[PDB]
DNA sequence: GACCACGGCACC
DNA sequence: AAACGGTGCCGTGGTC
Ligand SMILES: Nc1nc2c(ncn2[C@H]2C[C@H](O)[C@@H](COP(=O)(O)NP(=O)(O)OP(=O)(O)O)O2)c(=O)[nH]1
């Protein structure tokens with residue numbers, strides 16, 4: 001384009017270069033804009049931010065987050081990435097979008113601004129006529145990007161000193177386990193090397209090899225195969241404990257406290273909006289959507305996430321979300337009655353697993369039951385279900401058969417979805433979000449059936465993500481007016497931060513908004529708790 | 540230093 | 552590991 005003097009006119013498309021992918025940590029190297037056949041390159045990008053009223057262009061949210069970091073209210077506007085992601089959720093990166101819709105993603109702000117303009121015009125034209133996708137764009141994704149920008153810039157408080165001390169305790173427990181392993185193996189070696197561990201367990205020792213690795217065909221040392229040998233040898237027990245502790249230490253305990261931002265004093269993730277095939281968000285740098293919780297040690301890690309002084313965390317989580325969605329999508333009256341009668345299928349399944357009754361189930365049992373219910377639903381095999389549960393193969397067959405028989409209309413909806421998927425090439429959510437699944441007609445059974453599992457899972461998981469996103473859109477302005485903050489989303493859950501004097505009203509308000517986000521043939525129920533830390537707020 | 544593949548595993 | 556789905560990060564082992 002023709003070079004034009006900064007500032008650009010309103011509504012121009014922006015381009016920007018960051019020193020690193022994380023907006024909260026990045027140095028803004030260059031800033032440019034393009035409109036009306038002109039290009040505008042900023043002489044000093046930081047000062048030039050003040051001239052923009054809106055971040056409109058590729059990766060708009062990132063720039064908006066960096067602006068909020070600098071105290072500037074620069075909301076994100078149109079982003080061609082959001083248009084492409086709605087056209088096809090395999091559009092996940094600017095490189096691929098440009099290579100697909102006519103452009104080149106470079107490292108120069110001016111070119112990124114010019115690309116943003118062309119790509120918007122092209123993708124906008126491609127969506128001309130996709131009424132449902134346009135609705136998702138205007139009413140969910142585009143306003144959501146603003147919500148996520150505020151969440152990313154706000155961050156979450158972390159009890160660093162607590163995690164530092166925990167790192168030292170866990171270290172001593174790791175050393176003891178390592179010593180028991182070396183002594184049992186008769187020599188030292190790198191316990192973190194699965195290749196070296198393979199030799200010890202299966203060659204040196206005579207333990208049988210349950211399974212192989214996918215790509216290289218090596219004897220697997222995964223927990224699933226080692227769990228089979230939890231009695232066939234004692235060193236296996238200690239190795240599983242060693243991995244558990246090193247996993248949590250190396251992934252969470254040690255890195256997280258080193259990511260506190262100097263200006264905010266809090267921990268800042270990134271909520272990626274075009275990263276999944278089903279419409280879910282993802283979290284990275286660091287991923288705060290997979291903080292441990294299953295084990296007592298993992299719960300100790302959760303307690304590190306705390307509220308600012310004078311505030312309280314509010315945790316809200318949808319109940320049996322994808323099962324309620326399946327009720328609406330399929331119409332199985334039996335399944336609708338379950339929820340219109342207040343029954344809990346996770347608890348009910350936990351009863352048959354552990355042979356204990358209703359009131360006896362604790363969270364640990366119910367978690368196990370939750371994996372079973374969704375495992376069976378989305379196509380787990382009797383052989384694997386026999387592996388888990390530790391019941392005979394026939395006993396796993398009967399459970400899967402009774403599971404689907406309890407809700408007869410579910411299996412019928414699956415086939416309608418696949419038929420439509422085969423005919424149409426894609427499956428869609430309740431709101432029309434699409435995922436393309438061409439392999440539904442592949443000639444290799446394994447490939448075809450794998451694609452089938454992906455196909456009929458997407459409308460359920462995708463609808464749940466749609467509902468959550470829409471709830472965040474509706475809830476955010478209500479939180480601001482009450483002086484509350486939205487901190488985290490974990491697919492079917494939100495963590496808010498509210499002043500102590502308002503935490504109660506915020507919790508009630510957020511519960512109502514999430515439950516009424518979009519009435520279905522089944523009621524949506526939300527569980528809510530308040531506490532000083534993430535764990536106590538969710539229990 | 541920068542990338543990357545792989546096995547492995549944490550979250551919903 | 553295996554006919555659950557969706558993610559991202561770890562250390563290892565390797566290349567340039
Ligand atoms: N396929 C699959 N989906 C899963 C799994 N775990 C979770 N999901 C999906 C399906 C779940 O509906 C959704 C939310 O997960 P939660 O909040 O941890 N559990 P829920 O909402 O079911 O029940 P409650 O909140 O009353 O304990 O994530 C899994 O192992 N597999």
Ligand SMILES: [Mg+2]
Pocket residue numbers: none
């Ligand atoms: Mg991988």
Ligand SMILES: [Mg+2]
Pocket residue numbers: 556
């Ligand atoms: Mg899986």
Ligand SMILES: [Mn+2]
Pocket residue numbers: 317318319320321492
């Ligand atoms: Mn839930």
Ligand SMILES: [Mn+2]
Pocket residue numbers: 317318490492493551
């Ligand atoms: Mn949840």
